[PDB]
A paper describes a structure:
In the present study, we have identified a new crystal form of the derCD23–Fc∊3-4 complex in which different crystal-packing forces constrain the Fc domains. The crystal structure reveals a complex consisting of one derCD23 head domain bound symmetrically to each IgE heavy chain between domains C∊3 and C∊4, as observed in the first crystal form of derCD23–Fc∊3-4. The earlier structure crystallized in a primitive orthorhombic lattice (space group P212121) with three complexes in the asymmetric unit, whereas the structure presented here crystallized in a triclinic lattice (P1) with two complexes in the asymmetric unit that are consequently subject to a different set of crystal-packing contacts. No Ca2+ ions were observed, as in the earlier structure, although in the presence of additional CaCl2 one Ca2+ ion binds to each derCD23 head in the same orthorhombic form; the structure of this Ca2+-bound complex has also been reported. In the triclinic crystals, all of the C∊3 domains have a high number of (atom-pair) crystal contacts, ranging from 50 to 75 over the four chains, whereas in the orthorhombic crystals a lower number of C∊3 contacts ranging from 18 to 50 is found. The derCD23–Fc∊3-4 interface is dominated by the four salt bridges and four hydrogen bonds that were observed in the orthorhombic crystal structure described previously. However, one additional salt bridge and hydrogen bond, Arg440–Asp227, is observed in all four interfaces of the new triclinic crystal form and is not present in any of the six interfaces of the orthorhombic form. To form the hydrogen bond, the side chain of Arg440 adopts a new orientation with its guanidinium moiety about 1.1 Å closer to the side chain of Asp258 in CD23.
Numbering used by the authors:
A (entry chain F): 158 to 255, 258 to 290
B (entry chain E): 158 to 255, 258 to 291
C (entry chain B): 335 to 545
D (entry chain A): 336 to 362, 365 to 545
Amino acid sequence: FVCNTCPEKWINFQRKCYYFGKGTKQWVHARYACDDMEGQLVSIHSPEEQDFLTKHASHTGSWIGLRNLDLKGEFIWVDGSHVDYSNWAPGEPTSRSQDCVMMRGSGRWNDAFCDRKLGAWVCDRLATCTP
Amino acid sequence: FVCNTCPEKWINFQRKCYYFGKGTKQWVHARYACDDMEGQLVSIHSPEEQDFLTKHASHTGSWIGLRNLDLKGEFIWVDGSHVDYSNWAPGEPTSRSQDCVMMRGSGRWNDAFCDRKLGAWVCDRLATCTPP
Amino acid sequence: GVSAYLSRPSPFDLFIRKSPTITCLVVDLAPSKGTVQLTWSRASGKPVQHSTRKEEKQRNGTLTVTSTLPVGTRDWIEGETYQCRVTHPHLPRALMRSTTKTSGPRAAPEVYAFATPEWPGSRDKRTLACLIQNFMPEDISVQWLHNEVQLPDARHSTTQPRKTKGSGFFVFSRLEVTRAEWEQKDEFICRAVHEAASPSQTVQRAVSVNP
Amino acid sequence: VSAYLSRPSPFDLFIRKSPTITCLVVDPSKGTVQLTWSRASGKPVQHSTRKEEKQRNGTLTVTSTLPVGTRDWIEGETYQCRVTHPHLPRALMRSTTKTSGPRAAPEVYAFATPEWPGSRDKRTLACLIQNFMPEDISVQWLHNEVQLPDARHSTTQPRKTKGSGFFVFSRLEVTRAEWEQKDEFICRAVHEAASPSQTVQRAVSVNP
Ligand SMILES: *[C@@H]1O[C@H](CO)[C@@H](O[C@@H]2O[C@H](CO)[C@@H](O[C@@H]3O[C@H](CO[C@H]4O[C@H](CO)[C@@H](O)[C@H](O)[C@@H]4O)[C@@H](O)[C@H](O[C@H]4O[C@H](CO)[C@@H](O)[C@H](O)[C@@H]4O)[C@@H]3O)[C@H](O)[C@H]2NC(C)=O)[C@H](O)[C@H]1NC(C)=O
Ligand SMILES: *[C@@H]1O[C@H](CO)[C@@H](O[C@@H]2O[C@H](CO)[C@@H](O[C@@H]3O[C@H](CO[C@H]4O[C@H](CO)[C@@H](O)[C@H](O)[C@@H]4O)[C@@H](O)[C@H](O[C@H]4O[C@H](CO)[C@@H](O)[C@H](O)[C@@H]4O)[C@@H]3O)[C@H](O)[C@H]2NC(C)=O)[C@H](O)[C@H]1NC(C)=O
């Protein structure tokens, strides 16, 4: 069984498939948009996955699936898994507040306010297997 | 020298002159009305003075010149003089609001709120003397 | 005349109880026939959970109607905007109110509890005061405890959040206590639930009547 | 457009002996927002000071401060304020007079906060003034027997108690140089029913 089949307007990479959406949306509105497309906000756990995303991501700025429940204090992905691999920008994670994570055109991660309106977001779902 | 001459609509008694006004007015508005008539709110210092007032006062209720600066808490007349003679009603002076003084139809004094609207007030001024 | 107000959920209901609720209060100073009608909508366009409408006629002669809408814990914290449309038949314009999470800097609150001495004529009753200061944003939950169990909300009075000389906010809490209360247990806890409070959104201080 | 008419502070009424009532009108097109002053008596009024300032949010704020008589206010005189504007449809009227009802002396209690980590050279002083009626009260802070500026402290709005009285809280931040000079801070309260001479005060000390 091979996992490579992916839907229309989505791009394949490894055991996942990825969608790169365009339009003015907040972090929460991007999360709802991913659920509407039968997926969730992108979760990065390997440097190979990050490298693929940088090649297709918006040069302006994109939203990712990393956040904190505020009750926790530590960053936890939308799927539930903890942070094992971290590609933070110099000085990040910023403690200006004490928040959400966005991906720059360079591929580095930076802390941003949830109400901030970005023109890009990345959706992710598991790739369907072939007999 | 004799002090008995008094103006029109005013009544004479001893060395003073007295006016008995009719109309809806608060304690402060009665005080201003007294000044407008070249007098001041009534000041009682003798039982003879009180006896004359009861005979001419309104049966409903009238305003007098007794008050307190709030800073004192002590009752002092509008002219400035202290209380020597007291004709308070049973229980009065009350400490309900811990106020101003009004005269009943009976002649006795009772505490009342300043904003209370009464239909009567008493003005008083020194009677003009006549040549010897 | 008419006015509409839309509230945010209390940090106790948001962080501790894990069931947050937002209330839309509409004070109709000239009640009339028909009804007001309170529409609920999200900025996303997604459906809303069932709201509880509560209409009471006050002693002054005004109708007070409150619609308490339940919201998602993760949905509120993540920055979802909740809108409320109010449409009276005796009104030209439809009043719209919108509320969302206050996105800005964070500061942990500083709790200080105090006990008043015995005043002449007041022996069987004493007053307990609490100062909860330097915290941001303004949203805070102030609670009083006796025998490790919470005291009713009507028993105490908490001030509106006012800005401090620095950057934070300050709130005062007043709780009157009976002789039977301090004699059973001479300890009164003042709890404070806040967004930035650590650990687990709780900052509290104990106080005693004559220790 | 909204209009508000205030009462004088017990400090200006009882201590300073020069009370003043302010009419605040929060609007701003042709800002000829005239403020007429009149007594219920009809007697003339003393000269009012008009103060118009344009706020950062884009609204014009105009205040008219009218001086009133100490004996005239206490005795129950009603002071009226007529507000007129060209774009306004009907003239707004506001009236204020002395709150005539029961009296209660305030209960003053002062407190000092302990040292908080990161806050050594600065401490916070709190004071609770309770069980007084009517709601009008003047709260002041003193150091070295002389009064401190009003901007230095913050006093809460009068809220009702569980009984009959009212309560107010006062917050004052103090520097290290202040307590080291003299370790005594007085909390003065000026109220209608306060005895003797409208003054009720309590002293507090940073680490006594
Ligand atoms: C007839 O009598 C009734 C009372 O019986 C009066 O009704 C009150 O009216 C005022 C003003 O309209 C109401 O005050 C407002 O309350 C809002 C909500 O407060 C609480 O709401 C819930 C409690 O269920 C809590 O979750 C929440 O945390 C609050 O504790 C506030 O949001 C309002 O504030 C806004 O307006 C003020 C200015 O008015 C601004 O300064 C603020 O910044 C803010 O924008 C406001 O304080 C009050 O709640 C009403 N009482 C009741 C019981 O409903 C009538 O007004 C009165 N009629 C007349 C003619 O006087
Ligand atoms: C643009 O920004 C400005 C501020 O820069 C805002 O203006 C404020 O507006 C509010 C509401 O209109 C004003 O609040 C009112 O203040 C009155 C007076 O308070 C003090 O007045 C003098 C100080 O000079 C003192 O002598 C006095 O003791 C007070 O300390 C109050 O009387 C008002 O309260 C009335 O309503 C409440 C219910 O809401 C009742 O409980 C009261 O009994 C009373 O009837 C009120 O609180 C405030 O003063 C204004 N600020 C300034 C600096 O003028 C604008 O509103 C803002 N624009 C927008 C669109 O938000």
